[PDB]
Design an enzyme around this catalytic site. Structure first.
Site, short mmCIF file in Angstrom:
data_model
loop_
_atom_site.label_atom_id
_atom_site.label_comp_id
_atom_site.label_asym_id
_atom_site.label_seq_id
_atom_site.Cartn_x
_atom_site.Cartn_y
_atom_site.Cartn_z
N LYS A 116 67.12 89.93 14.76
CA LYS A 116 65.76 89.67 14.28
C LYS A 116 65.64 88.29 13.65
O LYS A 116 64.62 87.62 13.82
CB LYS A 116 65.28 90.77 13.33
CG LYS A 116 64.48 91.90 14.01
CD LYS A 116 65.14 92.45 15.27
CE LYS A 116 64.27 93.51 15.91
NZ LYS A 116 64.76 93.93 17.27
N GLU A 201 61.33 88.68 3.90
CA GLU A 201 59.96 88.30 4.21
C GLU A 201 59.06 88.61 3.02
O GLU A 201 59.36 89.46 2.18
CB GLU A 201 59.45 89.09 5.43
CG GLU A 201 60.11 88.74 6.76
CD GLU A 201 59.58 89.56 7.95
OE1 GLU A 201 59.82 89.17 9.12
OE2 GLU A 201 58.94 90.61 7.73
N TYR A 203 56.23 90.61 1.61
CA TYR A 203 55.78 91.96 1.91
C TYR A 203 54.27 91.95 2.04
O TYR A 203 53.57 91.50 1.12
CB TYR A 203 56.17 92.95 0.80
CG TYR A 203 55.70 94.36 1.08
CD1 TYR A 203 56.16 95.05 2.21
CD2 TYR A 203 54.79 95.01 0.23
CE1 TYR A 203 55.73 96.34 2.49
CE2 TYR A 203 54.37 96.31 0.50
CZ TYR A 203 54.84 96.96 1.63
OH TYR A 203 54.42 98.24 1.91
N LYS A 238 54.88 105.97 15.95
CA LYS A 238 53.49 105.85 16.41
C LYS A 238 52.94 107.22 16.80
O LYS A 238 53.66 108.07 17.30
CB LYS A 238 53.38 104.88 17.59
CG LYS A 238 53.77 103.45 17.26
CD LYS A 238 53.78 102.59 18.50
CE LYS A 238 54.36 101.23 18.21
NZ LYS A 238 55.85 101.29 18.05
N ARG A 292 61.77 95.99 26.41
CA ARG A 292 61.55 97.12 27.29
C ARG A 292 60.05 97.28 27.58
O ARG A 292 59.21 96.68 26.92
CB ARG A 292 62.09 98.36 26.61
CG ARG A 292 61.37 98.68 25.31
CD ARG A 292 62.03 99.77 24.55
NE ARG A 292 61.26 100.13 23.35
CZ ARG A 292 61.35 99.52 22.17
NH1 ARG A 292 62.16 98.48 21.98
NH2 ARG A 292 60.62 99.95 21.15
N1 OA2 Z 1 56.80 91.48 6.04
C1 OA2 Z 1 56.52 92.81 6.11
N2 OA2 Z 1 55.70 93.45 5.27
C2 OA2 Z 1 55.70 94.74 5.70
C3 OA2 Z 1 56.55 94.81 6.81
C4 OA2 Z 1 57.03 95.83 7.81
O1 OA2 Z 1 57.75 95.38 8.71
N3 OA2 Z 1 56.73 97.14 7.80
C5 OA2 Z 1 57.37 98.09 8.71
C6 OA2 Z 1 56.34 98.72 9.63
C7 OA2 Z 1 55.55 97.90 10.43
C8 OA2 Z 1 54.60 98.48 11.29
C9 OA2 Z 1 54.44 99.87 11.33
C10 OA2 Z 1 55.23 100.68 10.51
C11 OA2 Z 1 56.18 100.11 9.67
C12 OA2 Z 1 55.77 97.78 6.91
C13 OA2 Z 1 56.46 98.55 5.81
C14 OA2 Z 1 57.75 98.24 5.39
C15 OA2 Z 1 58.35 98.98 4.38
C16 OA2 Z 1 57.66 100.03 3.78
C17 OA2 Z 1 56.38 100.35 4.21
C18 OA2 Z 1 55.78 99.61 5.23
O2 OA2 Z 1 57.07 93.57 7.09
CL CL Z 2 58.77 102.25 23.01
#
Ligand code: OA2
Ligand code: CL
EC number: 6.3.4.14
Length: 445
Positions: A116, A201, A203, A238, A292
Site C-alpha cells: 500500500k 494517514e 483520518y 460491502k 482483480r
Molecule cells: N485515511 C483514512 N481515514 C479513514 C480511512 C479508511 O481507510 N477506512 C477504512 C474503510 C474505508 C472504506 C470503507 C470501509 C472502511 C475508514 C475507517 C478506518 C478505521 C475505522 C473506521 C473507518 O482511511
Molecule cells: Cl471484490
C-alpha cells in the site's frame, strides 16, 4: 481468442466468467473442491477437474493443483475471479512461469498494489490525489512519529502496508495513544501479513467510499468507466453498491477518471482494475487499488454497456479495448444488493439446503447467482450466495425496481439478508442518497 481457460474460482463469479467464455467461444475448465461438485457452473462447464477436498487451502488456494488442472486439460489461461488467489502475485508469477496466461495485470503490478505504501507513492507520482500522510513507512523513532502526526494533524490512522480492505488499521486521536497504536498495528500486521510495515494517514471522519473502474489493454489504451459508491457497508463488508455515485458531477467524474487512466499508462497497467477513494467534502483521496475484477462490477456494466469480463478475456488474448473513452457514456443508474446466507441476529454465515428458490425477473432486473432449488450452501466458503442488480433510467427507478425484485426473490431453507436489503431500500436517508461509510452500522444500532 484464448482456446480454453481454467476458472479458478467458485459460486456466482465462476458462473459469471463461464457465461463470458461461452459468449466468446472459449472452452471452459471448472476446477472445484469435492464439496462443489454440483455448482451450477461446474454442471455447465465443458470439462471439470476436482482439485481437492472442501477446505480452500487444499482446493481454491492450492496452486499446484490449479496449475496441474490447466496442464492436464490443455488450457491456456487461468481466470482467478475475486478472492482466493486473485491478488496473489506469487501465484500470478507461477502461472506465467508455467506457461499459462494469468487473467490480470503483470505479477509485478499485483505486487505493487499489494504494497500500500509503494502503491500510494506510485499514484501520487502519477498525479492521483492521495490522503495526506507519512509518504513512507513509519520507523521506531517515536519523536519522528509524533512529528509526522503533528504535521498531518490529529486524528490520524495507522495502516498496514500489507493490509487493505479495511483490515489492519487503527485510529489515533492524540499523542498519548500514538506509540501503543503503532506498536499494536505493527504486531497485528506481522501476524496477519508476515509484513510489519506500517504507515500513517489523516483520518477522515465521515467519508463516502467511491471507486473508479478502469480497463487497460496491451496496446497502450486505458479508459475509465465511471465510479461506484460502496459506502453502504458493515465492518468492511460491502452490502449495497451503486453506480454512478450520487452527487458526483460529470466534471468531477472526468477529473478523477482522467487521473486514474493516466496512472494506468504511467505504471504499465493491464486488464481490469479499481482505484479506491475516500470522498469527503467534495474531494477525492486515493487509498488503494484492486487488480482483480470485483464483486460489484455489474453496476458499472449496467450504466456503460461494457461487459467487463469479456474485456478481460479480450485483453488477455491481445485484442485492444472494444471501446474508446469518447464512446463511454454513463446512462441511467444501477444498484446492487448482495444476498448472503447469514443469520439476521448474529450476522454469522447460515449454510444449509435451499428448499424453494425463485429468482426475480423483468425489465432492468439482473440476477447473478449459482443457487437453485435443492442446492446446499456449504459451510466452507463465503456467505454471499447471490447478487441482485437493478438498472433504471434514474436512481429512483433503480431503487423501485430493486424493492419489487427483492419481494419476488424466494430463498427458503436457509436464513438470508433479503429482509435487511428491503429495509435499506426503504430507508429515507438511502433514498435521499449520499450516506457515508458509517451509516448502516448506526442504523442497525
Ligand atoms: N485515511 C483514512 N481515514 C479513514 C480511512 C479508511 O481507510 N477506512 C477504512 C474503510 C474505508 C472504506 C470503507 C470501509 C472502511 C475508514 C475507517 C478506518 C478505521 C475505522 C473506521 C473507518 O482511511
Ligand atoms: Cl471484490
Amino acid at each position: 481468442m484464448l482456446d480454453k481457460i481454467v476458472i479458478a474460482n467458485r459460486g456466482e463469479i465462476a458462473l459469471r466468467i463461464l457465461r463470458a467464455c461461452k459468449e466468446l467461444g472459449i472452452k471452459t475448465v471448472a476446477v472445484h473442491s469435492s464439496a462443489d461438485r454440483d455448482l451450477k457452473h461446474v454442471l455447465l462447464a465443458d470439462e471439470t477437474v476436482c482439485i481437492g477436498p472442501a477446505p480452500s487451502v487444499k482446493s481454491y488456494l492450492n496452486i499446484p493443483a490449479i496449475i496441474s488442472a490447466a496442464e492436464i486439460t490443455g488450457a491456456v489461461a487461468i481466470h482467478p475471479g475475486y478472492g482466493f488467489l486473485s491478488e496473489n502475485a506469487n501465484f500470478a508469477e507461477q502461472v506465467e512461469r508455467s506457461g499459462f496466461i494469468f487473467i490480470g495485470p503483470k505479477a509485478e503490478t499485483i505486487r505493487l498494489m499489494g504494497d500500500k505504501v509503494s502503491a500510494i507513492a506510485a499514484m501520487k507520482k502519477a498525479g492521483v490525489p492521495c490522503v495526506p500522510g507519512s509518504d513512507g513507512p513509519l520507523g521506531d523513532d517515536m519523536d519522528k512519529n509524533r512529528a509526522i502526526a503533528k504535521r498531518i494533524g490529529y486524528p490520524v490512522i495507522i495502516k498496514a502496508s500489507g493490509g487493505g480492505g479495511g483490515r489492519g488499521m487503527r485510529v489515533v486521536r492524540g499523542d498519548a495513544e500514538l506509540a501503543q497504536s503503532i506498536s499494536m498495528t505493527r504486531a497485528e500486521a506481522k501476524a496477519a501479513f508476515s509484513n510489519d510495515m506500517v504507515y500513517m494517514e489523516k483520518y477522515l471522519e465521515n467519508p463516502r467510499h467511491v471507486e473508479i473502474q478502469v480497463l487497460a489493454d496491451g496496446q497502450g489504451n486505458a479508459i475509465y468507466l465511471a465510479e461506484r459508491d460502496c459506502s453502504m457497508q458493515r465492518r468492511h463488508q460491502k452490502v449495497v453498491e451503486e453506480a454512478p455515485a450520487p452527487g458526483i458531477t460529470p466534471e468531477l467524474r472526468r477529473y478523477i477518471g482522467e487521473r486514474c487512466a493516466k496512472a494506468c499508462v504511467d505504471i504499465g497497467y493491464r486488464g481490469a482494475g479499481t482505484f479506491e477513494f475516500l470522498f469527503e467534502n467534495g474531494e477525492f483521496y486515493f487509498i488503494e487499488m484492486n487488480t482483480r475484477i470485483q464483486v460489484e462490477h455489474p453496476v458499472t456494466e449496467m450504466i456503460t454497456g461494457v461487459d467487463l469480463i469479456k474485456e478481460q478475456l479480450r485483453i488477455a488474448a491481445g485484442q485492444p479495448l472494444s471501446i474508446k473513452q469518447e464512446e463511454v457514456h454513463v446512462r441511467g443508474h444501477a444498484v446492487e444488493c448482495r444476498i448472503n446466507a447469514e443469520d439476521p441476529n448474529t450476522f454469522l454465515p447460515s449454510p444449509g439446503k435451499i428448499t424453494r428458490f425463485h429468482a426475480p425477473g423483468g425489465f432492468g432486473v439482473r440476477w447473478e447467482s449459482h443457487i437453485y432449488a435443492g442446492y446446499t450452501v456449504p459451510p466452507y466458503y463465503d456467505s454471499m450466495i447471490g447478487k441482485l442488480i437493478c438498472y433504471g433510467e434514474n436512481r429512483d427507478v433503480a431503487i423501485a425496481r430493486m424493492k419489487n425484485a427483492l419481494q419476488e426473490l424466494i430463498i427458503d431453507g436457509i436464513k438470508t439478508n433479503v429482509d435487511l436489503q428491503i429495509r435499506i431500500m426503504n430507508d429515507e436517508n438511502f433514498q435521499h442518497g449520499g450516506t457515508n461509510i458509517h451509516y448502516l452500522e448506526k442504523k442497525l444500532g
